[PDB]
Design a protein around this ligand. Structure first.
Ligand SMILES: [Mg+2]
Ligand SMILES: [Zn+2]
Lengths: 613, 1322
RNA sequence: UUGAUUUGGUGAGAGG
DNA sequence: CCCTGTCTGGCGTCCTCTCACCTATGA
DNA sequence: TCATATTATTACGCCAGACAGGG
């Protein structure tokens, strides 16, 4: 009754079953602002029975408690106004069932739903690892007043816009919205309204809506970008940018301080992520929340206007694919004719066959990748001119919405050399993609390769979860409990180099960590930075300009604090811009941030210089 | 030619390869196994006769009486299957066994017995199988799932790397019997051979040789060859066959015949062996340093002194040679211990052995097996002679002896079930050979090494357990038997056999509850091959390789239909064409290929036969003769897919469906999907609910017909003919004369099972699909079951789907649905709930069934009778009352009255009551008694009259050869008819013959109706104990709503997000809205591109349907329709279908075109499907654009979507994960007993488990107060939660926390040890 | 003072 | 007496939903 | 009904931790 997974510790004292809680299937609802979620009326009237009882007893409609329970058992016409007056400013904790890190419990404000499904704002889904293929989430109600304030001030969904494992934003726009942006801010060499001049972004959207120009048609506009070059003062500079119609329409949504060159490019997924990141580093939190919502709304709207389907003709077969396969078949014929006459060894034969099928696979991938990335060739006022294609699967790949090089490779080019479960590769590849039909043997080899992957994930998840458990129980105690340990020791952060090109730069390792002694400028004996400064982005840029060798920085393992970690030897807060506060549990967020990517990890001569120096 | 429901709607069948072997009956594993179990099969194998011929005749220990066997039988079941499911009894049969007791006198092995007695005794009841492969165990309908276990017979396993931490391989060898003790041999890293029995302690293995009465010299004769040292002129020369020097270093001077052959230093090559064989070199003189390391073979004794020189297996030194040379033993036999090949493993094991003779070997084996209790001669000898060598407790079966002789390369395959000396010695020899290098190991995933148990084998093993318990009981009663005052039921007892066989059929890991929501799901739960179960591996332990697909699965096990999660690849599903071998292995069909011409004869192979041959591929182009049109063809030799010549192959695959199963060969365009999404597609396709209106997949594979027939959910006609079609109650089929028996005039009356409960609360319902007066053939379907449409298989429905992002409402995998889907009720499924109410006599008198419900006012007496129990059918919801069932003394009276659960609605469709003999309220119980009483007689006479009408006419019909006088035959009406004498003329006995029929009809009807009333007149039929037994069947009708789950056949899951109006849908320029919008972004990542080809080909199918709907609505004479139908059925490449359409009588064209105006159904088979050019060509026959993509406008803005989008028809299914079975919320209610925390679940009104990682997530924030109320006030602390509820309803959000109760439970459980845990200072 | 039993435990299957 | 096979214990993912089944004996 | 009290299967995979054996 004590030990085990089902004893008292792990089953009734660390985890408890909980009143004022609910559970249902999630769905999208994209009209939401990212601090609010949809919550059904039936669940809302069940979770908030005591607040409704208290409200009903305050008005004077009833007398005893029984009367109120009969009123909400009957659900009369007056308790729905009571319910909209108990919801209004009262957050709830939404929770997806495998919570791995702290962004899997977030607090929203309810918006009542005719329905029986929790409507969950889409950007927030990338935090929960929540798709909508049958998922379920639990709602919990903060009862007391300190818990409502903790849900609004610590656990609100507007407050979690950076992942605590690093500095990367976690409210990155996921899949439909990056397709809507990548189709919006792009260009083509001729459209309606090529090379006309526009007096502002407002009439750019007016020309798109009336039907006189196209969403991607290159155009000189006059935009007014606000650069804040003074000390907190926004200076207007207006100019004519040679841009498109879609870039001006998306400029109507960008806040004041960002420059126009954040939208002047094509805006895949990495570019929109660094757009939101530069907005958070410059303009702070509130413009970044409202701008994340306006990004999501305009992405959904112009992805709807795009009509970006997928067809059977979109997967363009290379015309050179069959001759490449016949040249590889002639090469394996030459190698086996040498094998009949015994000139070569068996291992060298197997190595030569795997090498020519790897080379033919790379050539087929380059043939289809040229045939997709520049297939469109349209003329403008004369001879032809080429451009990047508006093929649907190519925009779904190039935008980074869903797809890569490998998946679009397997839908058009040959799908490689699949490997048998012995671990060694199979010498006869799967020369047929998915647009052509796989025959029987090729699909069976494919099933070898995919059954191994499903078995690996379904057995990998146990070790990933047990690793997170061991990590949060070794951490478990360590709380930021001082402000300075008063030391001069700390580890020597250098960039890491394995022997190829320099892998992880110093700005990734010494971003937001407080230096141990003052870094000498690389010239001679200068106090470039002082000895207890947090290295945020401005300091790291003045480190990259001076090409600083390596920084002696303060590390947690050198902290002199008895029973805890001081506030300087930890570093930056990582989801807050400042230093770690006195109190915030860093052992648990660290253990979750190491063990949470446990699913994505796998389970089962001489020196040649490259550069010149 | 076609049958008559085949000419209704003949599906356009793509497919180029002519099929040679039609699909076998898909439930043949279950049916053939259980038909093997119960069948009167003389020669004894296999069945119940094997059990009775093993256990009988029982003779006691010289008790001079020997009960023997004659014959067995199974009587009728007392309950047919329907009333058996209704009542709750097992569907069983009584097992009537004839037993013949003969009793001897003194001294009669040969003497005649003094007395006999014989009777048809009754032992157990065995559960029979329903005709569809199911059991009915206790009211519920269960399925035994066929196991996949290791075969009996020897296995040579390696375990090459992990032990010893030194890279040294071991080699063990397991002799797995079908029944009995396990014997394993195994090396250890000191290169010594060890035996262990039943995974016990480790004995050095040659002791088992010393247990088989082998001396040391005989063992060394077996496992070693002799090298002969002859004492000669000098230095004791050597016989040397040159094979023994292979690969070793020449230590000495190799010379003979006055010639130096090989000098010292160089290794001996095979050319030197050829020199020694050409030069005929045997005898060479050795140095004394050569014999100074070798080991003697046999014993030698000094002759004159009379003592021992050396024991066998002793290494030799020079002074030992001085001992044995001077005595007079001229021959010296040494053991050739080659370090390369012939290792000295047995000899070093003999050096490890602490034993010397046979008796100490048996004493050491007995001290291993049974410790503590002493080892005496009789006890140890009986132990070891009944370990392996008696027919009782050790039995390799026929499978085991076949594998045992096959793995040892024996010639024969049939032998005795026990082992012998030579078998154990051969296993040790093959293990030593594998260590030496020759021969190799076996793998365990190889399906030639992996047998299937099925229903008959498992029930036979449990029945044999019951029979050995009843023979120990018969041996008990007989030695205490007094004669002649007992007859054979004081000896025998029906209890242990029935107990064991109901233990297996009720509570086993394989007799499990049938997934019954779908015809597919029934027919693919019956074809399931589980690795789990008794004697097999477990879910949470193993492994990686047994979860993985091995190259012997090609055509035996489906590669892609295995459930994802904790058991992947343990719950494999059987392929389409794969039968089961005689021994239980998996044999699959192949086409025998003698020479260039591929012959149409089939021939079945298993994996231990598939390796030797060379087997072709299913789709390799052969034209008009069977000759492979290429000179090279892809085949597979020994699990290796490789390219071979035109004329080397011996077999070809039969058909191209044969790799996959019946779940994942219903997916069209399987070959274009990814493997992962085909797995998710098949596993979700098992989960579909039956819709209210079944709708014919436009893009099918043609295997829908075989699944919908072979799963017994449709009423397939037994005998062909016409129809009478009363049908409100039953289809009545008049039988054509050729299929009709001479006696038993006979017309077939099919029972339609109307609205009733499935095992997954779905609705199984049959509807007649034939009209009145319409010809049907044998094997044709008559009534469409759940999820069937004219004999095809209609799980979901086909809807117009656009691929586009639509305003974010289909973001990750969500699905946006029009209102035209929910207005038409085209997913509005029907669920049925059984609810029981009993009024058991717990304590303080019995409970009561009265409407006079207390405290509660005229809100109890409402949906009931004037004085008790829900009336019949209204629209009951949640909080209603169905069965008033409350006691007095339980003011102090209470409300246990079974009500309707919270959140559900419905209509009471049926009320069953076999209650405590007394339920009658006023006088209803006997009121209905008279109703049924008069009902029976009516139909009884009616049926007789029905036949009488047919017979009367038949009398006159035959009245021609013996009185055709039409005006002299219409005498008496209901009195007599025939008043003449035919006598002979040309034999019309026929009048007299029919006279007996009517005479017997009335005579039997009376008796038939006599028992009817007898059966009618009764309290009711059920078991005892339970008193008030009221079951009420609600039927909720759930429509579709934001939150349900839909999915196609390709793995495209979706939670339907927004239920749009019709106006806001994307309409094309023709005006029709699209029904369902999916999302294109799923398609490049999830590489299931087959849903797009299904979309385009379904678009083309409905294009033909719209074209026929125009040609038939704007009505044309049938020449233009038959021309367009002929063009639609020719269409393209060389196919199998074409049609013979000009023989459809100018009406069967029109009925076909009436059944095609919703869309022309297209069969795209599994791997030989429709190519893309045929999709484009079919889209050109309909007037649709060739790209598959139409420009679509927006319903909101009226303006065109740029870049035209894909619209087509995908067959989308509604899975039974409905959102108002998942929605749940809890504020406050009941909790558990032991702990003070809330209960768990939905059926218990309970709250969410705020688990461990959520606590770590709140610790990760600064949520200290949220966590404090999350584990103290909201959950556990009783004073805290009552103060909090009062604080909330006063308007004061403040918690008074206290200490959790489960921590004080922890303190008392820790303190209830010898542990003093406390709580210190303030 | 105005009412009541699953959690307990096993086995099997399913979802994310 | 310091290496050493060998044996014994102790881990092995969270959340949820549906169903059935529960000691023998006995004057 | 009211006290009487425990036997004829094996088929995980590391990975520490303690123990008798022997150069
Ligand atoms: Mg999912
Ligand atoms: Zn410190």
């Amino acid at each position: 009754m004590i030990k085990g997974k089902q004893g008292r510790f792990r089953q009734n004292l660390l985890g408890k079953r909980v009143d004022y809680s609910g559970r249902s299937v999630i769905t999208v609802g994209p009209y939401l602002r990212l601090h609010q979620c949809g919550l059904p009326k039936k669940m809302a009237l069940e979770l908030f029975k005591p607040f409704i009882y208290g409200k009903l007893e305050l008005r004077g409609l009833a007398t005893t408690i029984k009367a109120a329970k009969k009123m909400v058992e009957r659900e009369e016409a007056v308790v729905w106004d009571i319910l909209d007056e108990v919801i209004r400013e009262h957050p709830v904790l939404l929770n997806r069932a495998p919570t791995l890190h702290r962004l899997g419990i977030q607090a929203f404000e309810p918006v009542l739903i005719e329905g029986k499904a929790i409507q969950l704002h889409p950007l927030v889904c990338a935090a929960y690892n929540a798709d909508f293929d049958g998922d379920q989430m639990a709602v919990h109600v903060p009862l007391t007043l300190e818990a409502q304030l903790e849900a609004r001030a610590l656990m609100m969904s507007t407050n979690n816009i950076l992942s605590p494992a690093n500095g990367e934003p976690i409210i990155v726009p996921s899949q439909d919205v990056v397709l809507g942006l990548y189709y919006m801010t792009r260009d083509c060499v001729n459209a309606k309204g090529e090379g006309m001049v526009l007096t502002g972004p407002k009439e750019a959207e007016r020309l798109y809506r009336s039907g006189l120009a196209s969403l991607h048609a290159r155009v000189k506009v006059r935009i007014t970008e606000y650069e804040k070059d003074a000390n907190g003062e926004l200076v207007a500079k207006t100019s004519l940018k040679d841009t498109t119609v879609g870039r001006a329409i998306l400029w109507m949504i960008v806040p004041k301080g960002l420059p126009y060159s954040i939208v002047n490019q094509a805006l895949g997924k990495k570019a929109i992520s660094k757009m939101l990141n530069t907005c958070y580093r410059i303009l702070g939190l509130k413009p970044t929340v409202i701008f994340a919502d306006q990004i999501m709304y305009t992405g959904f709207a112009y992805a709807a206007r795009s009509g970006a389907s997928v067809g059977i003709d979109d997967m363009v077969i290379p015309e050179k694919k069959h001759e490449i396969i016949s040249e590889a078949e002639a090469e394996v014929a030459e190698i086996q004719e040498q094998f009949q006459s015994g000139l070569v060894t068996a291992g060298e034969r197997y190595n030569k066959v795997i090498d020519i099928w790897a080379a033919a696979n790379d050539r087929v991938s380059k043939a289809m990748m040229d045939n997709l990335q520049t297939e469109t060739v349209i003329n403008r006022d004369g001879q032809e001119e080429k451009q990047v294609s508006f093929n649907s699967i190519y925009m779904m790949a190039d935008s980074g919405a869903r797809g890569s090089a490998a998946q679009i490779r397997q839908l058009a080019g040959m799908r490689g050399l699949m490997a048998k479960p012995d671990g060694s590769i199979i010498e006869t590849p799967i020369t047929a993609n998915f647009r052509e039909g796989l025959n029987v043997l090729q699909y069976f080899i494919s099933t070898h390769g995919a059954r191994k992957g499903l078995a690996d994930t379904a057995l990998k998840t146990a070790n990933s979860g047990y690793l997170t458990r061991r990590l949060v129980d070794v951490a478990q105690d360590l709380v930021v409990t001082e402000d300075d340990c008063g030391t001069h020791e700390g580890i020597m952060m250098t960039p890491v180099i394995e022997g190829g090109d320099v892998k992880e730069p110093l700005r990734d390792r010494v971003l937001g960590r407080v230096t141990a002694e003052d870094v000498l400028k690389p010239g001679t004996a200068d106090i470039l930075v002082p000895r207890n400064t947090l290295l945020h982005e401005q300091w790291c840029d003045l480190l990259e300009e001076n090409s600083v060798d390596a920084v002696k920085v303060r590390s947690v393992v050198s902290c002199d604090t008895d029973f805890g970690v001081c506030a300087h030897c930890y570093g930056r807060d990582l989801a807050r811009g400042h230093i770690i506060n006195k109190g915030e549990a860093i052992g648990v967020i660290a253990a979750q941030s190491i063990g949470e990517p446990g699913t994505q990890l796998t389970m089962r001569s001489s020196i040649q210089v490259k550069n010149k120096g | 030619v076609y049958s008559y429901t085949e000419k209704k709607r003949i599906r356009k069948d793509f497919g180029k390869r002519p099929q040679v072997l039609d699909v076998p009956y898909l439930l043949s594993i279950q049916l053939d196994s259980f038909q093997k179990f119960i069948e009167q099969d003389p020669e004894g194998q296999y069945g119940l006769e094997a059990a009775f011929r093993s256990v009988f005749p029982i003779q006691s220990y010289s008790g001079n009486s020997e009960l023997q066997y004659v014959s067995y039988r199974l009587g009728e079941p007392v309950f047919d299957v329907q009333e058996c499911q209704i009542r709750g009894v097992t569907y069983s049969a009584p097992l009537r066994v004839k037993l013949r007791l003969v009793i001897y006198e003194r001294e009669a092995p040969e003497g005649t017995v003094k007395d006999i007695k014989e009777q048809e005794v009754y032992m157990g009841e065995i559960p029979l199988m329903t005709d569809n492969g199911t059991f009915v165990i206790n009211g519920t309908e269960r399925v035994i799932v066929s196991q996949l276990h290791r075969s009996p017979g020897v296995f040579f396993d390696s375990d090459k790397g992990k032990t010893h931490s030194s890279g040294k391989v071991l080699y063990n060898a397991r002799i797995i019997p079908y029944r009995g003790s396990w014997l394993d041999f195994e090396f250890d890293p000191k290169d010594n051979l060890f035996v262990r029995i039943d995974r016990r302690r480790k004995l050095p293995a040659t002791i088992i040789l010393r247990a088989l009465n082998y001396t040391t010299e005989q063992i060394l004769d077996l496992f070693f060859e002799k090298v002969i040292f002859e004492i000669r002129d000098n230095k004791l020369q050597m016989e040397l066959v040159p094979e023994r020097l292979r690969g070793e270093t020449a230590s000495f001077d190799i010379e003979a015949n006055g010639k130096v052959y090989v000098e010292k230093g160089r290794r001996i090559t095979a050319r030197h062996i050829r020199q020694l064989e050409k030069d005929d070199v045997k005898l060479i003189e050795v140095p004394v340093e050569y014999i100074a390391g070798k080991v003697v073979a046999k014993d030698y004794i000094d002759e004159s002194t009379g003592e021992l020189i050396c024991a066998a297996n002793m290494e030799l030194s020079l002074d030992l040679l001085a001992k044995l040379s001077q005595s007079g033993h001229k021959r010296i036999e040494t053991l050739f211990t080659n370090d390369l090949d012939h290792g000295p493993y047995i000899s070093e094991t003999l050096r490890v052995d602490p034993t010397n003779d046979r008796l100490s070997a048996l004493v050491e084996i007995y001290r291993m097996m049974r410790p503590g209790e002493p080892p005496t001669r009789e006890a140890a000898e009986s132990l070891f002679e009944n370990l392996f060598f008696s027919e009782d407790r050790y039995d390799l079966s026929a499978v085991g002896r076949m594998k045992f002789n096959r793995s040892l390369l024996r010639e024969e395959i049939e032998g005795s079930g026990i082992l012998s000396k030579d078998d154990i010695i051969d296993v040790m020899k093959k293990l030593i050979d594998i260590r030496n290098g020759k021969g190799e190991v076996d793998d365990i995933d190889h399906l030639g090494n992996r047998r299937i148990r099925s229903v008959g084998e498992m029930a036979e093993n449990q029945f044999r357990v019951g029979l050995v318990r009843v023979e120990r009981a018969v041996k008990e009663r007989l030695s205490l038997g007094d004669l002649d005052t007992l007859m054979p039921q004081d000896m025998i007892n029906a209890k242990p056999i029935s107990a064991a066989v109901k233990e297996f059929f009720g509570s086993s890991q394989l007799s499990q509850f049938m997934d019954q929501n779908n015809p597919l799901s029934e027919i693919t739960h019956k074809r399931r091959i589980s690795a789990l179960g008794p004697g097999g591996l477990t879910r949470e332990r193993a492994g990686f390789e047994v979860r993985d697909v091995h190259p012997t699965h090609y055509g035996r096990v489906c590669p892609i239909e295995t459930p994802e999660g904790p058991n992947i690849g343990l719950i494999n599903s059987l392929s389409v064409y794969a039968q089961t071998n005689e021994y239980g292995f998996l044999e699959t069909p192949y086409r025998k290929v003698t020479d260039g011409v591929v012959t149409d004869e089939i021939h079945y192979l298993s994996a231990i036969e598939e390796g030797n041959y060379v087997i072709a591929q299913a789709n390799s182009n052969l034209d008009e003769e069977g000759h492979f049109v290429e000179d090279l063809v892809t085949c597979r030799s020994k699990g290796e897919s490789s390219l071979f010549s035109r004329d080397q192959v011996d077999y070809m695959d039969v058909s191209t469906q044969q790799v996959v199963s019946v779940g994942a060969s219903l997916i069209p365009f399987l070959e274009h999907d990814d493997a992962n999404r085909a797995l998710m597609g098949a596993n979700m396709q098992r989960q579909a609910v039956p819709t209210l209106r079944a709708d014919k997949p436009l893009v099918g594979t043609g295997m829908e017909r075989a699944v919908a027939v072979d799963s017994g959910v449709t009423a397939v006609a037994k005998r062909g003919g016409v129809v009478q079609y009363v049908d409100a109650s039953r289809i009545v089929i008049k039988v054509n004369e050729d299929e009709m028996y001479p006696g038993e005039a006979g017309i077939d009356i099919y029972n339609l099972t109307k609205y009733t409960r499935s095992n997954q609360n779905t609705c199984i319902n049959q509807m007649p699909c034939v009209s009145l007066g319409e010809p049907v053939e044998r094997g044709d379907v008559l009534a469409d079951g759940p999820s069937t449409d004219l004999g095809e298989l209609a799980l979901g429905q086909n809807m117009r789907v656009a691929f586009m992002p639509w305003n974010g409402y289909n973001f990750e995998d969500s699905i946006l649905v029009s209102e035209r889907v929910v207005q038409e009720d085209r997913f509005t499924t029907i669920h049925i709930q059984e609810l029981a109410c009993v009024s058991r006599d717990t304590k303080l008198g019995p409970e009561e069934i009265t409407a006079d419900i207390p405290n509660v006012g005229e809100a109890a007496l409402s949906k009931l009778d004037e004085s008790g129990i829900v009336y019949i059918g209204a629209e009951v919801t949640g909080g209603d009352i169905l069965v008033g069932k409350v006691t007095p003394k339980g003011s102090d009276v209470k409300d246990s009255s079974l009500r309707v659960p919270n959140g559900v609605s419905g209509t009471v469709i049926d009320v069953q009551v076999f209650t405590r003999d007394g339920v009658e309220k006023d006088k209803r119980a006997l009121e209905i008694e008279e109703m049924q009483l008069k009902q029976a007689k009516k139909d009884l006479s009616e049926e007789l009259q029905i036949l009488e009408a047919g017979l009367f006419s038949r009398i006159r019909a035959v009245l021609v050869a013996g009185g055709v006088e039409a005006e002299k035959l219409d005498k008496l009406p209901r009195d007599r008819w025939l008043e003449l004498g035919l006598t002979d003329e040309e034999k019309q006995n026929q009048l007299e013959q029919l006279a007996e029929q009517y005479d017997e009809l009335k005579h039997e009807f009376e008796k038939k109706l006599e028992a009817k009333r007898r059966k009618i007149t009764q309290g009711d039929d059920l078991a005892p104990g339970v008193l008030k037994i009221v079951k009420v069947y609600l039927a909720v009708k759930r429509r579709i709503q934001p939150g349900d789950k839909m999915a196609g056949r390709h793995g495209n899951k979706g939670v339907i997000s927004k239920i749009n109006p019709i106006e806001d849908m994307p309409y094309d320029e023709n005006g029709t809205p699209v029904d369902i919008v999916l999302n294109p972004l799923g398609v490049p990542s999830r590489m299931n591109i087959g849903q797009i080809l299904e979309t385009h080909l379904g678009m083309a199918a409905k294009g033909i349907g719209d074209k026929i709907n125009a040609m038939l609505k704007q009505q044309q004479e049938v020449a233009k329709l038959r021309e367009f139908i002929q063009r639609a059925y020719d269409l393209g490449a060389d196919v199998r279908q074409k049609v013979d359409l000009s023989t459809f009588s100018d009406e069967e064209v029109m009925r076909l075109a009436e059944n095609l105006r919703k869309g022309m159904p297209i069969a795209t088979p599994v791997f030989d499907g429709a190519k893309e050019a045929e999709i484009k060509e079919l889209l050109k026959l309909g007037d649709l654009p060739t790209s598959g993509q139409i420009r679509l406008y927006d319903g909101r803005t009226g303006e065109q979507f740029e870049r035209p989008v894909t619209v087509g028809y995908m067959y989308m299914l509604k899975l039974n994960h409905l959102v108002d079975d998942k929605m749940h919320a809890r504020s406050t209610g009941s909790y558990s007993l032991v702990t003070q925390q809330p209960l768990g679940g939905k059926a218990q009104f309970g709250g969410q488990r705020f688990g461990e990682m959520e606590v770590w997530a709140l610790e990760a924030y600064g949520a200290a107060y949220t966590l404090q109320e999350m584990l103290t006030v909201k959950s556990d602390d009783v004073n805290g939660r009552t103060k909090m509820y009062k604080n909330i309803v006063d308007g004061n959000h403040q918690m008074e926390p206290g200490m959790p109760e489960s921590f004080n439970v922890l303190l008392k459980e820790i303190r209830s040890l010898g542990i003093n845990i406390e709580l210190e200072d303030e």
